[PDB]
Design an enzyme around this catalytic site. Structure first.
Site, mmCIF file in Angstrom:
data_model
loop_
_atom_site.group_PDB
_atom_site.id
_atom_site.type_symbol
_atom_site.label_atom_id
_atom_site.label_comp_id
_atom_site.label_asym_id
_atom_site.label_seq_id
_atom_site.Cartn_x
_atom_site.Cartn_y
_atom_site.Cartn_z
ATOM 1 N N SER A 168 -18.536 74.717 0.005
ATOM 2 C CA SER A 168 -18.544 76.132 -0.243
ATOM 3 C C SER A 168 -19.937 76.687 -0.495
ATOM 4 O O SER A 168 -20.349 77.659 0.142
ATOM 5 C CB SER A 168 -17.564 76.482 -1.360
ATOM 6 O OG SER A 168 -16.206 76.298 -0.941
ATOM 7 N N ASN A 211 -10.363 74.309 4.860
ATOM 8 C CA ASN A 211 -9.872 73.645 3.673
ATOM 9 C C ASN A 211 -10.865 73.497 2.567
ATOM 10 O O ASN A 211 -10.486 73.476 1.419
ATOM 11 C CB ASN A 211 -9.300 72.259 4.006
ATOM 12 C CG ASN A 211 -7.970 72.328 4.751
ATOM 13 O OD1 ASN A 211 -6.910 72.515 4.153
ATOM 14 N ND2 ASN A 211 -8.021 72.129 6.071
ATOM 15 N N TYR A 212 -12.157 73.356 2.887
ATOM 16 C CA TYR A 212 -13.126 73.170 1.821
ATOM 17 C C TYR A 212 -14.015 74.358 1.556
ATOM 18 O O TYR A 212 -14.962 74.275 0.790
ATOM 19 C CB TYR A 212 -13.990 71.939 2.112
ATOM 20 C CG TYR A 212 -13.191 70.656 2.244
ATOM 21 C CD1 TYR A 212 -12.761 70.196 3.485
ATOM 22 C CD2 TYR A 212 -12.841 69.917 1.120
ATOM 23 C CE1 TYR A 212 -11.992 69.029 3.597
ATOM 24 C CE2 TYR A 212 -12.085 68.758 1.219
ATOM 25 C CZ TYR A 212 -11.654 68.316 2.450
ATOM 26 O OH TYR A 212 -10.867 67.179 2.426
ATOM 27 N N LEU A 213 -13.669 75.483 2.165
ATOM 28 C CA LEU A 213 -14.466 76.686 2.057
ATOM 29 C C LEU A 213 -13.778 77.842 1.367
ATOM 30 O O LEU A 213 -12.756 78.311 1.824
ATOM 31 C CB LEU A 213 -14.872 77.114 3.462
ATOM 32 C CG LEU A 213 -15.600 76.025 4.264
ATOM 33 C CD1 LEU A 213 -15.757 76.471 5.697
ATOM 34 C CD2 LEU A 213 -16.946 75.684 3.635
#
Length: 458
Positions: free
Chosen positions: A381, A415-417
């Site tokens: 992120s 998914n990871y942002l």
DNA sequence: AAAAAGACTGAAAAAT
DNA sequence: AAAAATCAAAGTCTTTTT
């Protein structure tokens, strides 16, 4: 607690097996042979996959062969004893044909079924949780078939059985109309546990794990977790400095343990390796993560390619995807890695005195809610956020900026942002969210889209 | 303690 | 008009059993 009211219709069971046409035949040792319905069904599974690499794997062929036999009649067992003698070609021709047919169909044909499909989804694709109707992610039970394990999965080719209502556990509120099972059947059980989020579940026969029917990402129940997920990551941001300074201190402990986790924490933080939970030796495909790394996956190089203190990672991570990397680490880390490899054999754990439980326990102690995976979210992120500021051309053209978005989006998945980050950038720069996120993403990220402004900072 | 039990990405099909 | 172009295994982490 996850809800107050939960009423849904239950799963859609797999369509019943359609016996092969007479003309379609199977040969054994040159001879023709009409297969028992069950043995036939299993064979079709293999037949439909002859165009696939799975069928060229010995693990697959064997697992399939053995399981197929358990379903054969006594006579079939006596006869069919060599896979190499079975001829699934004609079966294969048939299904391929069937597929072509569906391709070569009239718009009249196509539309009917398309509406047929809409009737199932409108009826079984939603449920009522609390005050609103909700969309269900997967309302159909996984059909019987051959197990497609990834990598060298020792179970690939095994037969996944057909799930009956009798194997199905229904979950809904106490006051809800219980979905009635197919006529002549019964559910395995019905429960009203407002602590879980699932509507339906059952135990898969190949690994004995439990499969569930849950809600769409656009769910409040789902969405809310995601929101919480990024928050947790944001919190890591603040404590990361404190955290990096502590394990950076632990790198010099009189407790290889303190040192084992610290080093691992390092890689996780720095390289974003996954936690690495131990997997069942002999029942799964051997892939590893940080905590489970073995001596053999690491190879140290005092100096390399002009680089000094290089760690050479070479192993199979999640999904058997190979992670090769040359990583110049900090001296104390490099050396520590030597200490950790001292008098050990390749087939040994690098972090012998460490596991995910231990590690995560420690992380929790450092910050409530902190687990290994949070480092992946956080690292991803922050990068996009900072690369977006750094690369966005303040006097750009909507499409090129989108390039900037891709460029920023390069060094960094949905998914990871933290989506709010992209939500902020799009507003500040007047780039329609529609330009980056599609209908569904907007569906899914509605919360980030509405609760974040051009002022957002992860 | 640690196992076992439980609860939450790839790739194939479909959408000139 | 047609064709060519663009679902579910496998992890993590928690809870329960031993």
């Amino acid at each position: 607690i996850k809800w107050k009211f939960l009423e849904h219709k239950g799963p859609v069971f797999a369509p019943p097996y359609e016996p092969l046409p007479e003309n379609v035949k199977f040969y054994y040792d040159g001879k023709v042979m009409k297969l028992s319905p069950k043995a036939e069904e299993v064979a079709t599974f293999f037949a439909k996959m002859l165009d696939h690499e799975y069928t060229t794997k010995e693990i697959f062929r064997k697992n399939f062969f053995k399981d197929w036999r358990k379903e054969m009649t006594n006579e079939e067992k006596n006869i069919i004893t060599n896979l190499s003698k079975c001829d699934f070609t004609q079966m294969s021709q048939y299904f391929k044909a069937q597929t072509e047919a569906r391709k070569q169909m009239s718009k009249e044909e196509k539309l009917k079924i398309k509406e047929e499909n809409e009737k199932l989804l409108k009826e079984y694709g939603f449920c009522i949780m609390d005050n609103h109707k909700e969309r269900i992610a997967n309302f159909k039970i996984e059909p019987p078939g051959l197990f497609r394990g990834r990598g060298n999965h020792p179970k690939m080719g095994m037969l996944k059985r057909r799930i009956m209502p009798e194997d199905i556990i229904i979950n809904c509120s106490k006051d809800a109309k219980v979905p009635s099972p197919p006529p002549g059947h019964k559910w395995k059980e019905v429960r009203h546990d407002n602590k879980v989020t699932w509507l339906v579940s059952w135990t898969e026969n190949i690994q004995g794990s439990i499969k569930y029917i849950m809600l769409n990402p656009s769910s409040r129940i789902k969405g809310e977790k995601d929101w919480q997920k990024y928050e947790t990551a944001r919190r890591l941001k603040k404590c990361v400095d404190k955290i990096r300074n502590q394990y950076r201190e632990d790198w010099k402990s009189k407790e290889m343990k303190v040192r084992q986790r610290a080093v691992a924490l390092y890689f996780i933080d720095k390289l974003a390796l996954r936690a690495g939970n131990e997997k069942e030796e002999g029942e799964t495909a051997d892939t590893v993560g940080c905590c489970s790394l073995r001596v053999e996956h690491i190879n140290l190089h005092p100096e390399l390619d002009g680089q000094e203190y290089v760690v050479e990672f070479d192993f199979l991570g999640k999904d058997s995807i190979r992670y090769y990397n040359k990583v110049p680490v900090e001296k104390r880390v490099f050396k520590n890695l030597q200490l950790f490899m001292e008098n050990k054999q390749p087939e040994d754990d690098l972090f012998d005195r460490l596991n995910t439980g231990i590690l995560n326990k420690h992380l929790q102690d450092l910050m409530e809610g902190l687990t290994a995976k949070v480092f992946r979210t956080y690292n991803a992120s922050i990068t996009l956020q900072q690369q977006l500021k750094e690369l966005t051309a303040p006097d750009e053209n909507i499409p090129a900026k989108i390039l900037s978005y891709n460029r920023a989006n390069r060094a960094v998945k949905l998914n990871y942002l933290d989506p709010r980050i992209t939500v902020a950038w799009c507003k500040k720069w007047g780039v329609p969210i529609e330009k980056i996120y599609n209908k569904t993403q907007r569906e899914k990220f509605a919360w980030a889209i509405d609760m974040a402004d051009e002022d957002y900072e992860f």
